[PDB]
Ligand binder design. Structure first.
Ligand SMILES: Cc1ccncc1NC(=O)Cc1cccc(C(F)(F)F)c1
Ligand SMILES: Cc1ccncc1NC(=O)Cc1cccc(C(F)(F)F)c1
Lengths: 304, 304
């Protein structure tokens, strides 16, 4: 028993982290096979950032201008290309530590582990969620660009996020491993604000099931509700509308605990309307929305 | 900017995790050099657990009775010994992935990363704190015994915790890597309750500095206090008494933000007496005590 914001073990991702320098800019790169992936803003200067013409900037760059270093050894760049907002640096050596991997585009509400890196070296790992407004609430400083978000299915690492920028609101924006930004964000130092951030209802319900599984049952009540009634309350509190698809994913958790999904919804309804009254759930004084139903099943069953 | 409960990258520890079987019991082991460390309760049966005579039980065991497996390959046990509550299984092969390591006994209030494991395989990594009552609030299931807690200083892994048991209160108890339990706990399935759990005051103050560094400044006030006045309030709310040693460790955070330690104490005093009033600090509705002043400096400066 016990419930933690658990990240995936980061070893398979540490062996992929390299340092990429271009001009006076140094960020992180992802070395998979004979290719190094990194943010394309590596080719910019602090003046270029206001409105960079990445096509024109890349044209003034050669393979020898991109300095790639894995650990303390230099990699030989034999090709460079821009794919959306990432550069793909073809190196002459395949990464001997390349794991089984996939490049996947996650959905808002889905969670992932971030391996924060500086100068190609790992500093820490934390569990994150793609916000419904496509931002991430991470922990990143100057030099962290190139840090990746990932998930692990037994031996396969599914890369989903590459960190690119911090918005003036302190929140983080990035791309998938094909260089497409999540959300409306552009890699330009301009006025950018994310949409309204809603709470991932299905994740909060999944964490309510994790609480019951661990003994924290105080919030359970004698009531039920309907999807429509619950959703009227969810909208009032800027929660994601709950669908039958969400109910179905909560099926295993409902089966394990014997508490019907709509019954759990009624508990959530009362928690939203009445608050926690000074109590805590799983050591938290607010409703946690960064554990998907898959994360709860995984953590409560010990999937390695 | 941004602040997360960040764990150390776990790669150096994944390469040490093995599976140790003895009789019908399977738990995790730590392979460092030619030695495998694991909980000594691996030699017990479900009947022996009520009051095991570990000396007598170990005597009925030979080197060939301990099945050690790293990945999918078998290790040859050439020696076995009991050191306090751990078994040290000498194997004929040194771990080719052994990092630079130390065995350290941490203090209550200090934090560490846990790599939770099942059948010698890693499932996840989270950041933990040694509670003042010497328990840990982790996430462990049957098969997780042998999972280690650690800290990383550049290339050196300092092992501090080995997971042994869950108390009937759902909290976790374990030893250092010399087999000495933290706290009064014994590796016996008997009535065991931990002392009163107090809040690590210096860590809460360190996290208040992390909040100010990230823009969450609402809780800052026009007041100050003294160590004695603050401590009268800390005792009333079961907080650890703040000493001059704690003030000194908060020196770098005080210097960075320009907010005197006693000034921050006065904010904490008002937060304890008046509550959060429905607001949040670093996305939390309660006072976080699982980040030491070292963790805050490390995360806010990007130490790899
Ligand atoms: C300083 C920091 C902190 C956290 N995460 C990331 C960062 N770094 C940045 O944002 C770097 C940056 C600066 C201006 C413009 C861009 C660009 F995407 F090209 F538009 C990127
Ligand atoms: C089931 C579980 C969950 C979380 N963490 C740990 C566990 N497992 C245990 O506690 C195993 C255990 C059982 C009874 C007695 C002991 C002993 F330490 F020898 F005394 C240990």
């Amino acid at each position: 028993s016990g419930f933690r914001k658990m990240a995936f073990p980061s070893g398979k991702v540490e062996g992929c982290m390299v340092q990429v320098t271009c001009g006076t800019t140094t960020l992180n790169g992802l070395w998979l096979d004979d290719v190094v992936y990194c943010p394309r803003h590596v080719i910019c200067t602090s003046e270029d950032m206001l409105n960079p013409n990445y096509e024109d900037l890349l044209i003034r760059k050669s393979n020898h201008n991109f300095l790639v270093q894995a650990g303390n050894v230099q990699l030989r760049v034999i090709g460079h290309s821009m794919q959306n907002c990432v550069l793909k640096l073809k190196v002459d050596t395949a990464n001997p530590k390349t794991p089984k991997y996939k490049f996947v585009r996650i959905q808002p509400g889905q969670t992932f582990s971030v391996l924060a890196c500086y100068n190609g070296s790992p500093s820490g790992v934390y569990q994150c969620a793609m916000r419904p407004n496509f931002t991430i609430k991470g922990s990143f400083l100057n030099g962290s660009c190139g840090s990746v978000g990932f998930n692990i299915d037994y031996d396969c690492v599914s890369f989903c996020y590459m960190h690119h920028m911090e918005l003036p609101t302190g929140v983080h924006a990035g791309t998938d491993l094909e260089g497409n930004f999540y959300g409306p964000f552009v890699d330009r130092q301009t006025a950018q604000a994310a949409g309204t951030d809603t709470t991932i209802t299905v994740n909060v319900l999944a964490w309510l099931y994790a609480a019951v599984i661990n003994g924290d049952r105080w919030f359970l009540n004698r009531f039920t509700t309907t999807l429509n009634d619950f959703n009227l309350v969810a909208m009032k509190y800027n929660y994601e509308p709950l669908t039958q698809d969400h109910v179905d994913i909560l099926g295993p958790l409902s089966a394990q605990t014997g508490i019907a999904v709509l019954d759990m919804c009624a508990s959530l309804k009362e928690l939203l309307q009445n608050g926690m009254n000074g109590r805590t759930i799983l050591g938290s004084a607010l409703l946690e929305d960064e554990f998907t139903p898959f994360d709860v099943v995984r953590q409560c069953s010990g999937v390695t």
